[PDB]
Subunit: 152 residues, 6 copies
């Protein structure tokens, strides 16, 4: 949907525990993306098994699920042009060792299991993840007055 | 409840529009309070009339309600010692003209109608506001590992 | 003029030298005031003797003038409600020893001679200072799109 | 001129509108470059047609000129070693989608039409741009006391 | 000694644990004070009983000593005009509930037992504390090039 | 030693002079590494000749040694997984002209002689540098409570 593209972001429990929710939000705000959904939730194992369904035969899958249910996450939807790809970029490589400073993981994380945040890896994944984590009435349209200064 | 005291905060639509959600969250995080609930909602006029029920005979009540329903707000619950009173302090006086720099309003706001954020003004108000805006299953207990360094 | 009130600010040479121009500007921006004039100039002794004409029989007047002409200053005009009084507040007491942290002087300055910035001390002073330092065609009207979120 | 090299920077109207002037200035300050000229101006279409003369057969040229005249810009000259090339780097790729986080565009911009700032693309361009936008008596020499700690 | 006045600061173990050492240092740097001594130490109970000798009949004394020996502290000496009194101010009231936002405790602390930092409360205390915690050859004179812009 | 790896960092005198000690510390803190040693020292020429022993036939060696002894440095040891390599990365290329924004040198430095900080370039170098600059009883173990949220 061009500038109506959406991605799903989740601050993982390490993010909440280390108090970096604000910091992360702020990076998306100042980049100019539009916050259209935000919930602090304790994810169920049922949901997380579906979230991570593509990773079900990998050896990390049990621990990854038990982890993401271990604490509160902050679930989020961000809207704007190319937001999925750009989010991946702001966040940085999956392994923080490969995430250059300036990215969230580059700045704040050391190890791949405690890398602070999930972002949808494709427009497809975002559609699925958004529907899985959020009811349609939790996604907000609002008239974004900043948008005259972010888009032509 | 001592260190289990809770207060309700809401970023008003100006806060969302001006992109200060992250900024505000970050101030509460770094102060050490524990985020126990968070959503982005479009508040109904029905809810807001109950929220602002103590102010129903003042002349600004209608416009205040029509305002807070004008856009998305970010509703929030924060937990910690004396959190209600301390929140009021971080936020600053209701009229920003009286809010000393260092406070959120002192730093970011000019006029009382566009003062960015609501905080519960008493323990009583917080009880009511929390119940009004949030179901009990939206408030999260999580084992706060920072708390050994915030409380004796 | 209400929300059209204007004040004159000058980053003094210490501010420029210590690299705090951006920092200071940013505080005014984020407070919500509207930047309507800005130049980097070397003030002449003639101008500064008139600028500081109220202080001409104090013993320190010579040194204050020779100082402010010692380097580049950043001259500025800021517009908004109560901007003169609020600027005085953001800046802090004239002697930084009396300027509480959170204010510019409270955060960045130690001694009264090197207190980083001048702000008009009254609406009267601002009228005079603005005319003294700036031609009318250097003050800009621009359609401030943030203003819907700072004023009612 | 080595460490006397100069580049022309302009905060575009989006930068002013979004209140990022201070932020941008501050990045140049803290990098260690020396601010030698600064004004807030409303650029004329005549000037901007000459400024963007190299881009006169591109399809974006009309809209780019009408844009940059649409609002106030902050025009700037920065001095230091390799300042032109390094400015290009701090700013980031022309298309923000290609600008890595840590750069100004990477951090703050989404689309190429609203990319916040112009920087001279060569020493040649800077010479021309500086003369076009600034009288010689607007460029200041000042004894930079930080410079002992930026240059060997 | 005027502008040669010195105070002793210690980031307490909560400050180290919560990762606020840099943050605290930065506040003193940007205020303009001169760092003349710095080490990370594990304080002995013997030292701490002497450090807190003024507080020996209060009921909190045992726990305060066992606490400050519980972890690493960052010991510091800062030099400049009125630095003792001004430090007390930047830090904020002993009980953070009384520390206004903008101060370190106001911004970062909730409870008096975990208030992040100690600062000498008098010139006398600073003399004693500096000698107790630091050898004379750990205090550095260095030619402070910023000082021409902090003092007249 | 895995997550017990250590690196030696030194803020060079330019760092101290330009007041960026806090800033630098803060970057390491927020990345999650563990500060295990810290002092402000005036390095002797004898020590620095040993520190820079690998560079003894290069033409810059005399000036490099006379420089690093010219003022106070802040010596530091940081512990965590891959801390040596990651420190190199946070710091940026040796020549700041090649250091992308987001890195310390990319953000703060212009020229190679005044590039603010040294970091060990290998685990080997760190072992040597740590022993050269620090007694064993200056390196602290402390029970890092943040570590559950940085490592699995």
């Amino acid at each position: 949907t061009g500038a109506h593209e959406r991605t799903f972001l989740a601050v993982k429990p390490d993010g909440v525990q280390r108090r970096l929710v604000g910091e992360i939000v702020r990076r998306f705000e100042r980049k100019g993306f539009k916050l259209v959904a935000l919930k602090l939730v304790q994810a169920s194992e049922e949901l997380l098994r579906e979230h991570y369904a593509e990773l079900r035969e990998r050896p990390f899958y049990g621990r990854l699920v038990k982890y993401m249910a271990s604490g509160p996450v902050v679930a989020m939807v961000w809207q704007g042009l190319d937001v999925v790809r750009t989010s991946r970029a702001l966040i940085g490589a999956t392994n923080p060792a490969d995430a250059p400073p300036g990215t969230i993981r580059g700045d704040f994380c050391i190890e791949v299991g405690k890398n602070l945040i999930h972002g949808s890896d494709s427009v497809e994944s975002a559609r699925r993840e958004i529907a899985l984590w959020f009811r349609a009435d939790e996604l907000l349209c609002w008239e974004d007055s900043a948008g005259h200064w972010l888009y032509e």
